[PDB]
Amino acid sequence: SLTREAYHRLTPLPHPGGRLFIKPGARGYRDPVHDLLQKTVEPFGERALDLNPGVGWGSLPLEGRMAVERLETSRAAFRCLTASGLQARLALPWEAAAGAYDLVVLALPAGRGTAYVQASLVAAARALRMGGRLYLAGDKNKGFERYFKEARALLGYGVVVRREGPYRVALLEKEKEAPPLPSLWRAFSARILGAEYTFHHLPGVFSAGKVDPASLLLLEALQERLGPEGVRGRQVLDLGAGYGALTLPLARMGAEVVGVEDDLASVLSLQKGLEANALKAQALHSDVDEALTEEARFDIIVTNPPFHVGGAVILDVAQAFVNVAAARLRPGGVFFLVSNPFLKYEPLLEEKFGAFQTLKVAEYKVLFAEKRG
Numbered sequence: 001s002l003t004r005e006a007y008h009r010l011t012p013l014p015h016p017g018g019r020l021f022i023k024p025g026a027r028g029y030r031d032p033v034h035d036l037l038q039k040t041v042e043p044f045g046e047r048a049l050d051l052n053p054g055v056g057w058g059s060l061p062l063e064g065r066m067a068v069e070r071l072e073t074s075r076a077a078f079r080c081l082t083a084s085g086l087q088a089r090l091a092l093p094w095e096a097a098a099g100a101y102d103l104v105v106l107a108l109p110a111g112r113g114t115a116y117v118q119a120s121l122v123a124a125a126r127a128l129r130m131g132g133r134l135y136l137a138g139d140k141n142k143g144f145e146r147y148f149k150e151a152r153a154l155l156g157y158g159v160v161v162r163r164e165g166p167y168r169v170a171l172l173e174k175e176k177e178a179p180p181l182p183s184l185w186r187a188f189s190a191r192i193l194g195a196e197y198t199f200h201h202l203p204g205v206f207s208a209g210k211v212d213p214a215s216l217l218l219l220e221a222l223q224e225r226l227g228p229e230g231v232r233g234r235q236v237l238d239l240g241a242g243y244g245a246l247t248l249p250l251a252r253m254g255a256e257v258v259g260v261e262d263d264l265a266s267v268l269s270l271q272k273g274l275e276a277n278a279l280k281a282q283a284l285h286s287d288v289d290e291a292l293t294e295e296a297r298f299d300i301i302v303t304n305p306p307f308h309v310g311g312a313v314i315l316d317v318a319q320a321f322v323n324v325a326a327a328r329l330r331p332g333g334v335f336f337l338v339s340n341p342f343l344k345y346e347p348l349l350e351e352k353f354g355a356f357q358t359l360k361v362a363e364y365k366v367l368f369a370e371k372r373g
């Protein structure tokens with residue numbers, strides 16, 4: 001459906017008094033949680049901090065009325081904030097300065113998992129000065145109640161200030177000293193293709209604590225098709241690199257790998273993973289191929305695209321992955337993609353490459369395609 005032009009296109013949408021840029025892959029718009037926040041938040045003090053900005057809809061009401069800092073981890077969303085002219089920093093929630101804010105706005109990043117959420121909760125508690133306030137928004141169907149009560153335990157006072165369907169916004173006040181940030185880094189050893197690796201990652205990464213079965217299947221298929229030395233000295237693009245499940249092995253195999261990842265936490269995870277294993281590769285914080293030059297081309301492109309649990313529809317970002325792969329590959333170059341059995345990638349590859357091959361069919365399927373000039 002979406003073309004590369006359309007995926008990377010930044011579209012400004014109107015709202016009373018201004019405009020806000022949104023784009024495919026950027027969270028925040030058409031989101032009930034952020035929408036309820038926008039209708040609830042009001043100025044308090046002089047310094048505010050948004051720990052889950054997205055396109056900036058939730059804390060927009062504070063814009064122009066008090067100093068507002070936005071810590072964004074999504075490159076896609078960051079592009080939007082930048083285009084909208086909204087003060088924002090490429091940073092993790094827990095990188096927020098302690099005791100420097102009067103107000104904190106936080107739409108619960110439930111989709112990121114409990115670890116990421118709790119880290120954000122403590123970050124908010126630490127960022128606030130004693131007496132500071134926190135606007136916490138969420139979905140009761142997505143743990144709002146649990147996190148709200150945990151937030152209350154961390155700060156003290158806290159009550160719901162707005163309701164709409166299962167969506168909620170609570171306002172809490174820091175009455176007690178915040179605890180230290182919990183340990184954020186995790187590490188686990190894994191063997192891939194007969195080699196040992198030690199992966200390091202922060203909260204919220206895909207397949208935390210273990211190498212994903214699908215990722216392993218892709219590498220197995222790749223080695224069978226190209227051989228153990230098949231990627232040596234070759235330029236490889238890893239779409240959605242994560243903490244490096246595919247990136248590290250390929251780099252160790254001698255390839256010159258470029259990993260593009262939209263999530264900041266995942267990017268830092270990849271960087272430390274490479275360092276810890278004495279491997280070198282480009283860990284780019286990028287919305288698909290946004291960070292690349294117009295001329296950049298590759299010999300091999302691999303990917304374990306994002307997907308919705310239990311869904312049979314390919315995500316826009318995933319579709320973009322395929323479009324970019326086809327456009328970024330040099331004639332004769334090869335594309336490797338792994339996905340659950342419920343995603344209709346075949347007709348997509350057929351369209352973009354003209355033909356494809358199924359290398360493996362198990363719990364997951366590994367598809368292959370060669371770029372024709």
Ligand SMILES: Nc1ncnc2c1ncn2[C@@H]1O[C@H](CSCC[C@H](N)C(=O)O)[C@@H](O)[C@H]1O
Pocket residue numbers: 025076206207212215239240241242243244245246260261262263266286287288303304305306317
């Ligand atoms: N717009 C985007 N641009 C780049 N990467 C993205 C993206 N949207 C999602 N991703 C990342 O794509 C990865 C898909 S999950 C797989 C991760 C890793 N390749 C592995 O095999 O373990 C995740 O890291 C997800 O955060």
